[PDB]
Amino acid sequence: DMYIERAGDITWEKDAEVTGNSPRLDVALDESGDFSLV
Amino acid sequence: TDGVYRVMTRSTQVGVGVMQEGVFHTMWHVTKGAALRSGEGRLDPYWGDVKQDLVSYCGPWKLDAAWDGLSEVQLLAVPPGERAKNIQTLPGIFKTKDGDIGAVALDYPAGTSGSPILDKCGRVIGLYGNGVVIKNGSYVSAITQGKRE
Ligand SMILES: N=C(N)NCC[C@@H]1NC(=O)Cc2cccc(c2)CNC(=O)CNC(=O)[C@H](NC(=N)N)CCCCNC(=O)[C@H](CCCCN)NC1=O
């Protein structure tokens, strides 16, 4: 039994917490949908 | 109705998706392309692509907004057992032989897969959860978007 349940509205939040870097990565994508690092 | 939804198996949250224009959008690895229940109703898989890791239910892919390649974005993360929260970030880039894809360096549990990534207008520019693990064990997700035909 795989089912869905509503979890909220889709809305941009003003003045939000900002985190994470902006990595520049060389990757490959295979036919099964898997990304890998080159 | 339109909104963000948890995808559950009976319970465990295995992912998240977006309802827009009567179509439910999630990542293929969340459902393996199988049918879903919504209340007493059944959602049938209509379109999908394992290489993109995407699937849509009840109709074709509807999400057509694209990352502008410049601006900060928000992950509307819906982690298992936690309410939806917005996390703003400046994407990095997956550079591939077929072009660049925006990517977010944000790390959440596996069942957060399918959470939408948003532009400043609140449009869904892609779904979170298909990515790579970098050397230190942290995670980077593509901003995975389908084609609205
Ligand atoms: N080509 C390949 N297989 N790339 C795989 C990339 C990546 N898979 C992993 O992170 C597996 C993994 C690897 C090491 C350690 C852990 C998990 C333990 N972590 C957790 O148990 C919670 N966190 C985590 O699982 C990840 N964070 C982390 N630091 N490892 C964040 C997962 C976010 C949601 N996405 C997924 O679950 C997909 C499913 C598979 C889609 C395939 N097409 N997953 C991924 O993309």
Curated annotation (Swiss-Prot), chain A:
Residues 8-30 are annotated as: Disordered. Residues 1-38 are cytoplasmic. It is found in: Host endoplasmic reticulum membrane. It is a multi-pass membrane protein. Residues 4-38 are annotated as: Interacts with and activates NS3 protease. Required cofactor for the serine protease function of NS3. The central disordered region transitions to ordered by binding to NS3. Forms a heterodimer with serine protease NS3. May form homooligomers. Interacts with human SPCS1. Interacts with non-structural protein 2A. This is Serine protease subunit NS2B. It comes from Zika virus. The lineage of its organism: Viruses, Riboviria, Orthornavirae, Kitrinoviricota, Flasuviricetes. The chain holds residues 1418 to 1455 of 3419 of the full protein.
